[PDB]
Design a protein around this ligand. Sequence first.
Ligand SMILES: CCN1C(=O)c2ccccc2N(C)c2nc(Nc3ccc(N4CCN(C)CC4)cc3OC)ncc21
Length: 263
Amino acid sequence: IPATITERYKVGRTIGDGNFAVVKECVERSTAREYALKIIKKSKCREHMIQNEVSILRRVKHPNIVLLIEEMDVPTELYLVMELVKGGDLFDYTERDASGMLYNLASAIKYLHSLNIVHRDIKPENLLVYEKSLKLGDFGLATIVDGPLYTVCGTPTYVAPEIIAETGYGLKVDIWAAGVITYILLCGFPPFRGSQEVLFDQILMGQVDFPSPYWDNVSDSAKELITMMLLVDVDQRFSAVQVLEHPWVNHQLSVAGKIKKHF
Ligand SMILES: CCN1C(=O)c2ccccc2N(C)c2nc(Nc3ccc(N4CCN(C)CC4)cc3OC)ncc21
């Protein structure tokens, strides 16, 4: 850790240990304010999968997206001081609670889409909870849409069918991932479960089903919203605006004791 960081910040324990970065909690010495420190290891050769994610982060300012406070660039790694969300991810209850979560998620997705940004890795692990409100994070896979995209990326559970097809995709792959998440929030398991290729062939059909007994006491409005969010026809599929105008975003759920089993 370089002296430039420690002069102003006090790095602490590790709260995020992915394969692509390290996150730690830290305190600004001047103001005794908590923040998060993202440490991104650079390639041993002296670069654009890091710079791009930073270029994205300098443009995003929304109450439902983890905020970039400041950045320090160093030869071996790049240090990002970001806002700290102390609640944990989506894993860490009612249709009323879940509907507010999609509202936060769709407000972020709507904001990003106005800047032609596609997140391409929206999943529960990348959604953080303030004590509830959600905040979207990890813009490593985000990119600006200037044309159809053909790169297959993201965790296969939340990947849209047109990504699997490799025919071209765009801004509406984030609505699909949000639909899968909302589906999970209501019953605790994913719409397409598979049995590696079986999952891909299942998603490509796009048969969203609400089985019994889990989906019996969930409103038809949520079913209608989820079905419109998970439409294989991209043109028909809902936009972030269409999701936010839906009445379900504007009854206890037996969901936890099954999220721990499936994930
Ligand atoms: C650099 C900014 N940032 C992201 O960009 C970010 C984006 C996506 C995912 C994780 C991120 N990291 C790690 C972030 N994680 C958090 N918060 C957070 C999270 C988890 C925990 N625990 C750790 C201990 N185990 C046992 C329970 C959970 C504790 C946390 O805060 C105290 N606030 C901001 C993040």
